[PDB]
């Protein structure tokens with residue numbers, strides 16, 4: 266049976282733990298192990314990859330299916346020699362549920378004025394603030410795919426008003442959606458903007474000052490919030506900073522950045538209404554990843570269509 | 582028609598705003614207005630009260646129904662001269678939904694290691710941490726009433742394992758519940774303990790070091806968390822502090838305190854894994870409060886039973 270190459274820049278202890286009993290009957294070649302640094306990888310059919318080294322595909326020229334370790338494929342699409350074979354992205358209940366946790370947390374942190382209450386606590390000052398309920402806030406989600414839909418449904422269940430935007434219009438109970446041409450109408454209703462878009466050439470720099478200026482000022486805080494857990498390349502950080510400084514944006518939650526890891530010299534670390542997380546909104550459960558890859562391999566070898574195959578021209 | 586006395590120690594601008602068009606056809610006597618400081622209040626049937634002055638019931642001896650401005654009645658039950666007539670507590674979708682927001686926020690803040698990521702951000706340090714999903718954590722809620730049930734259902738929908746405890750066993754889909762005698766079994770399964778109990782003589786000092794020592798150490802963080810938004814008198818703050826210092830408790834979210842407002846000299850303000858909020862977990866929407874009171878008055882005057890009447894002997 267073909268081995269499976271594992272080249273995942275994840276927390277090493279998590280990958281190592283998941284290797285036990287993974288891919289039964291196949292050799293598993295974990296490229297984090299120095300013992301494998303010279304192994305020729307010709308004749309091997311499958312690789313599971315995340316932030317892999319530039320030479321990987323020259324070493325493994327006979328791959329039949331490439332599996333991303335994440336939902337996003339904007340990096341793997343750039344790897345030199347990426348083979349002309351199906352590229353399968355990671356889609357799984359574990360990833361989806363994790364993203365929705367992070368999105369819900371940000372919407373609650375902003376709704377419930379967490380930074381204000383923390384500033385009061387720093388002064389040892391007890392002060393109750395006037396407080397809207399979730400239903401007083403419209404959360405607008407750009408990207409109505411696997412992650413956007415789950416987050417929308419969960420936010421609505423917690424009481425937020427929720428609307429969605431994507432290229433085509435999606436039909437979702439309890440969530441009004443807009444297609445591409447509806448962007449401006451969607452923005453004008455949105456108090457908390459949530460980004461769950463892939464990075465593609467068409468989404469590069471989409472979150473910019475002109476867009477933030479179209480967000481609603483009619484909500485309970487009088488100024489919108491920007492929350493991004495898609496990709497950093499979709500935002501213009503110079504504009505985010507300008508808009509936070511001026512008050513065009515009242516706050517932000519950023520999990521993703523134009524250049525990661527985020528520079529230690531970035532202003533974002535110290536800003537009073539910005540929450541920074543280090544690209545952890547939805548971690549890949551490595552056990553679940555390997556179960557997913559196993560399942561797709563079994564489909565492939567039985568002559569069934571692969572699931573979650575990306576359109577390389579579209580970039581997602 | 583009888584006037585309605587309003588004596589609510591809430592944010593004044595909120596009460597004032599809600600007075601417009603409230604109680605149509607009745608004089609509304611807002612005791613926050615100095616113009617009313619000498620008004621005799623005999624012959625008046627209804628009062629809506631929160632943190633009211635010790636002399637209120639000597640001024641208003643002819644009340645037929647007393648309405649609490651909150652869900653909790655432990656303070657109003659202590660007011661001198663509280664009349665021997667029905668005491669109606671506040672129960673409303675707005676209050677419930679607000680509590681569930683706060684409970685969800687705390688469970689997510691603790692699950693998602695928010696304080697760790699904030700400490701990293703303070704150092705301008707990008708570091709991903711190993712991260713459990715919600716389903717890896719058991720949230721145990723003490724108090725399975727209006728607030729406890731709603732919070733349990735919402736937490737379960739976001740992926741947490743949820744169990745509940747109260748005096749009698751409650752039947753709730755997707756949430757295993759325990760009765761009084763099941764407390765120890767319940768505690769031993771609980772990673773995040775959430776308090777949503779009233780203060781009564783039987784719940785005074787219930788959250789103490791012996792109880793925290795029975796919480797699970799088998800969860801993903803190896804140490805339990807304590808979250809209280811019931812009443813401060815149910816907890817022993819000396820024990821909370823001892824247990825945080827020793828690591829018996831890994832963290833806490835406290836909305837309520839033994840003596841409020843919380844002393845500026847309290848250690849809780851500066852502790853690295855304690856979130857302090859100033860008794861704001863579920864604010865009373867004053868408009869909704871007045872609609873509720875109006876509805877109960879109409880029932881009363883039509884000969885229908887009042888709803889949400891407290892048992893003064895039980896204290897809730």
Ligand SMILES: NC(=O)C1=CN([C@@H]2O[C@H](COP(=O)(O)OP(=O)(O)OC[C@H]3O[C@@H](n4cnc5c(N)ncnc54)[C@H](OP(=O)(O)O)[C@@H]3O)[C@@H](O)[C@H]2O)C=CC1
Pocket residue numbers: 335336337338356364407408409410411412413430431432433434445461462463464465467468494495496520521544545546547548581
């Ligand atoms: N921060 C983190 O830890 C993580 C980040 N992510 C990011 O989240 C992204 C979304 O994942 P997922 O929901 O699974 O992806 P999906 O492919 O399921 O959804 C993508 C959505 O974006 C929309 N879209 C794409 N391009 C455009 C465009 N030009 N204009 C308008 N809408 C557009 C799609 O529209 P349509 O339906 O019309 O095609 C679709 O609704 C990933 O690509 C990845 O970058 C994912 C996991 C973790």
Ligand SMILES: NC(=O)C1=CN([C@@H]2O[C@H](COP(=O)(O)OP(=O)(O)OC[C@H]3O[C@@H](n4cnc5c(N)ncnc54)[C@H](OP(=O)(O)O)[C@@H]3O)[C@@H](O)[C@H]2O)C=CC1
Pocket residue numbers: 651652653654672680723724725726727728729746747748749750761777778779780781783784810811812836837860861862863864897
């Ligand atoms: N922090 C904040 O902003 C707010 C705090 N609160 C607090 O939340 C409390 C709960 O409100 P709500 O859910 O509406 O009240 P409910 O009366 O609906 O529920 C109370 C629950 O506590 C249980 N209980 C009471 N005494 C005991 C006991 N000795 N042992 C075990 N279980 C007990 C009851 O059990 P049983 O069902 O068997 O009677 C019931 O499940 C309020 O009393 C108030 O103090 C409320 C609003 C806002």
Ligand SMILES: [Cl-]
Pocket residue numbers: 509515516536537538539
């Ligand atoms: Cl800011």
Ligand SMILES: [Cl-]
Pocket residue numbers: 825831832852853854855
């Ligand atoms: Cl602490």
